[PDB]
Design a protein around this ligand. Sequence first.
Ligand SMILES: Cc1cc2nc3c(=O)[nH]c(=O)nc-3n(C[C@H](O)[C@H](O)[C@H](O)COP(=O)(O)OP(=O)(O)OC[C@H]3O[C@@H](n4cnc5c(N)ncnc54)[C@H](O)[C@@H]3O)c2cc1C
Ligand SMILES: Cc1cc2nc3c(=O)[nH]c(=O)nc-3n(C[C@H](O)[C@H](O)[C@H](O)COP(=O)(O)OP(=O)(O)OC[C@H]3O[C@@H](n4cnc5c(N)ncnc54)[C@H](O)[C@@H]3O)c2cc1C
Lengths: 484, 487
Amino acid sequence: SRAYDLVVIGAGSGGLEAGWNAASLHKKRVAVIDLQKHHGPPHYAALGGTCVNVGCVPKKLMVTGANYMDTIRESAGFGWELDRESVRPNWKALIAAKNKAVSGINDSYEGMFADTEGLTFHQGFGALQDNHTVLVRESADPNSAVLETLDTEYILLATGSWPQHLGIEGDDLCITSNEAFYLDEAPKRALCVGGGYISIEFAGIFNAYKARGGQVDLAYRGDMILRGFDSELRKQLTEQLRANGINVRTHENPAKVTKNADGTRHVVFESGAEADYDVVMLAIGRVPRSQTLQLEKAGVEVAKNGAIKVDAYSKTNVDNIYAIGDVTDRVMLTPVAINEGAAFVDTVFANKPRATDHTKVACAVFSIPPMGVCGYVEEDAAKKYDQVAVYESSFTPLMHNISGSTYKKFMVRIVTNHADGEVLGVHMLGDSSPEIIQSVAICLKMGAKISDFYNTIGVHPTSAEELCSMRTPAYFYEKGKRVE
Amino acid sequence: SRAYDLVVIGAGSGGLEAGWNAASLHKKRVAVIDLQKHHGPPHYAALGGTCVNVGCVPKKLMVTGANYMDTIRESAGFGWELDRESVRPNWKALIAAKNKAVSGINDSYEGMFADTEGLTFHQGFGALQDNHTVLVRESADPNSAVLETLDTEYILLATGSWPQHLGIEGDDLCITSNEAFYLDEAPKRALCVGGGYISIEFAGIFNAYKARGGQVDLAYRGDMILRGFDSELRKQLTEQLRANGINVRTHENPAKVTKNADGTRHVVFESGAEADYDVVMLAIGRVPRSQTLQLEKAGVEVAKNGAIKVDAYSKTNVDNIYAIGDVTDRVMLTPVAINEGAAFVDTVFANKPRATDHTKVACAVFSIPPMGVCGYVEEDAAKKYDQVAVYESSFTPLMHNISGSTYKKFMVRIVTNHADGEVLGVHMLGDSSPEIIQSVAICLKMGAKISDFYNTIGVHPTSAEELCSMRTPAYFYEKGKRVEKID
Ligand SMILES: Cc1cc2nc3c(=O)[nH]c(=O)nc-3n(C[C@H](O)[C@H](O)[C@H](O)COP(=O)(O)OP(=O)(O)OC[C@H]3O[C@@H](n4cnc5c(N)ncnc54)[C@H](O)[C@@H]3O)c2cc1C
Ligand SMILES: Cc1cc2nc3c(=O)[nH]c(=O)nc-3n(C[C@H](O)[C@H](O)[C@H](O)COP(=O)(O)OP(=O)(O)OC[C@H]3O[C@@H](n4cnc5c(N)ncnc54)[C@H](O)[C@@H]3O)c2cc1C
C-alpha cells in the first residue's frame, strides 16, 4: 500500500490541479515535485508552472502595460490634452510591479499545502528509478545526489515544455522568453526571432517600452508569421504590427550572433544583412521537457521531439504512468493542461473515465492588437468536409476614425461545414477579441450553426455584434478546392 | 398599381431597415419620411434615426473619450511617467470629432437613396389623412403647408421615442440627451436626473470631462439606479460610480429649477436640499413619439402612453398599417427595431410571416465600468420556476491591483433553472462585458445549460473565462423563497 497514491512531477498548470483534486477531493496522498518555490532565475518556472511564473500572468500584465502607449496616444483625438513630449515609459517600474504580482501568487501556493491533508510539496529534480519509484535529485545530472525516494502507486508526468534555441554561433548571446521577464532595462533595439505568438507578443511589449528612436525587428524564417492561424488574419496582423513601428522580417534567420564591444549584439542574418540590437530574443518554439526524467528506466514511450506519448486518457504505455500538459504535446495552453489534469483524476481515482476534448479550443494572441480564434482554419476543415463556406467581415471602428489608429481593422472570419451549416472555426482580430472568443467557444461546444449566430439580436454598439450579421459565404471550398 | 407600396414615417433603425429591404429586395415603391437629413438642432434625430444621430453612436464615442480619464490615470502603475498636471479634457474637441463622425454617416445615407431604384426620401412631418394617404407637411402644426400627399398601400409608422419631461417649475431650464450632445463647454457641476442607462452613461461622460474641482451629482427617485437589472450588479455599480467621483443621490427628485444670475440653474429637491449646477439633464424616460401622426384619421389604436398598439407581427388594428420600434414600446433598442423591420418586410412583401423575438435580448449599459446583461434576473425566474439556482462570482482583475483602480471588480452572476440546469440569465459588470455578453445571448438562445458553460475550455488570462468556472450554485429560490440550500 505504497507511501504515495500519486506523485506528480511538475507543479505546473496541469500537475497542480491533478494533485489538489486527488488530495482535496479523494483523500489521496500526493507528493508534488518542482524545482523551486518562487519565480525567477535559475529555473524561472517554479511552483505553479510556466503560466503563473513566466507565462500568461506576467506576460498579460506586461501586454497591458504596452497598451498605454497606444491609448495615451489615441486619447488625443478625444480631447485629452497633456504634455505629450514628456511621456516616458519606465521599464523598471513595470517589472517591479509584475514581480510583486507573481510572487503574490507564489505565496498563495505555499499556504495551499498547509490546508490540504495529504498534499505534500517536494523540492528538487524529479526522475524515475522504476514505475513506482520517483527519485528527487538535487540536480538534473543523472548521478547527482538523491534527496528523496518516493514510493507510489501512480505517477503523473506534468513537466511542461521549455524554450528552443537554434544551433548557431552566438546562440548564447541571445535570451529567451524566460530572461526577457527579468530584463534590467528595456531594449532600445531588440530582435524577436520567431513567428509564434510568444515572439509576436514580446515584440509588441518591447516596442511600447523602447527608448525614443529605438527599433523592434521581428525576424521569422518563413513567409508569414503565426503559422497555424487564419492566413487572412495573419496578413492583417502583419500590417498593423508594422503600422505600429515593428519591422516584420519574413524570410530572415540569425546566421551568426556576435557581441559588440559595447555589449550589444551584432547579428548577421542568412540573407546577408547584419544589424545590431541591445537584445535578441529567441522565441522559436517550446519543446516537451522530458529529457532528464529517465523515462527509459520506467519503460515509458516518447516521440521523436521528446513528447511523452499518451492516448485519449493521457495514459502512457505503462498502465499507472500518466502524462499531461505541454509535455504530451497536444495543445500547449494553460486551460487545456488543467482540463487534462482534472480528467486524469476522474479517470483513475473516481472511476469515471473522461478524456479532454482538444477540438474547438479557444485561444488568444495578446499581440497589439490581439486575436481570439476558436476551431478550424478553412484549410483543415476543407480537407475534412465535402464543402465548407467561409464568411468574412472587416471594418474600422468609428472610434479609430477618431483616434488616429485607422489601420486598426476589426476582422471576423467564420468557417462552416456547408452541408449542415455547423460552425467549425471562428477567427477574430481586433480589440476585445480574446474576451469575445470565450463565449464564442461555448457556442461551438454546443455545436452552434451559422443560423444560430445570425438569428441572435445584436448588442449595439459593439464589435461582437458583428458575429450576428454574417449571412452570406464569401466563397467556399468544394471537395477541397476554393469555389465561388 | 397605387402611388407607393410603402410609406415609412421615420427614417430610423427600423424605418430604414424596412425601407431598404422592401425596396432593394422586393422591388417595392418605398417612400421614407424624416424631418431632416442631418444630425442636430433643430430636430436632433434625422435621417439614420435616433441611434445614429443622438444615441448609440455619438454616445459610444463620448464614453470612449471619457474612458481616457481612467486609462491615462492607471498607466501610472505600469510605469508610464508624464506631466500629470498637464492633463486636461477638451470637450469642444470631443464634440467636433463626434460631429464629424455622425455627419459622415448622414452623408452616406443620402447616397443610399441615390443608388436604390424604388427607394425614395421625403422630408417633413408625415401625418395620416386616412389608411392609404400620407401627408408630408411643413411642420408639427396641423395647419402646416402640406408639402406633399403620398398615396399608399401599406403604412409603417416608425417614429421612435422622445425624451420625457417633468412638469416642475423650470423644467424648461433643463436639457435632455438631445441637447447635451451639443453642449458648448463641459459642465463643471452637472445634475443627471434619472436612474436609467442614459442618465448613468451621461454622468460618466460629464464626470470625465468636467473642469477640475467640478462635480456631477446624479439624482434618482427610486432606491437604486437601473430598475430592471440584476440587484447585485446595480449595487456594485453604485459603489463603482461613487468610487469614481459621481454623487449618486438616491431618493432625490428636483422640485423646482430656477436660473441664477450667472446663468447657472439653482435646484431645490423635494427633500428640501438645494444646489447649483451649470447643467440639469433630465434622463428620466422616453416616450413613444406618436402624438402628431393623427392616427385618429386612419383609425389606429394607441395605448395610454402614446404607444401604438401592435400584434406579434407589428400590425395595427388597421390591417394595412404596421408599427415598429421605440414607438410600439417593446424593447427600445436599435437591434430590436431592426430585426422587427426586417420581419415586417417578409410578413408583408414576402408572405413569410415573422415575429421578432423580444426575449433573450442581450443589451448593455455603457457606464464606467460597463455592464452586459442578457436574461432573467433572479426575481423573475423565481416567479416562473419552482427551483432556480444562482451562481455568482466577483473578482478584481490583477491589472487593477497594479493600476490602482482597485474598486474595479468584475462581477458575473448566472441564474439557471435548477431542475434541468437551463441558463436563464447571465449578467456582468466590468470592462468588455458588452462584448462578452453578445455570444452568451447566442448560447442562451440555443438553450444552453450551465454544464455547457463550465464544460467549455477557458481562454486565459481573460475576464470572460470566469463564465466557464461557475459549477456550484451560491443560493436558490424554492417556490419563490430564497433558501441557502434545496431541502
Ligand atoms: C511566454 C509564455 C506565455 C504563455 N502564455 C500563455 C497564455 O497566455 N495562455 C495560456 O493558456 N497559455 C500560455 N502559455 C503556455 C502555458 O503557460 C502552458 O501551456 C502551461 O503552462 C502548460 O502547463 P503544464 O501542465 O504543461 O506545465 P508547466 O506549467 O509548464 O509547468 C511545468 C513545471 O514542472 C517543473 N519541472 C520541470 N522539470 C521538472 C523536473 N525534472 N522535476 C520536477 N519538476 C519539474 C517546471 O519547473 C515547471 O514548474 C504561455 C507560455 C509561455 C512560455
Ligand atoms: C441617448 C441615447 C442613447 C441610446 N443608446 C443606445 C445603444 O447603445 N444601443 C441601442 O441599441 N439603443 C440605444 N438607444 C435607443 C435607440 O436609438 C432606439 O431604440 C432606436 O433608435 C429606435 O429605432 P426606431 O426605428 O424606433 O426609430 P428612431 O431610430 O428613433 O428613428 C425615428 C425617426 O423618425 C423620425 N420621426 C419622428 N416623428 C416623425 C414625423 N412625424 N414625421 C417624420 N419623421 C418623424 C425621427 O426624425 C427619427 O429620425 C439610445 C437612445 C438614446 C436617446
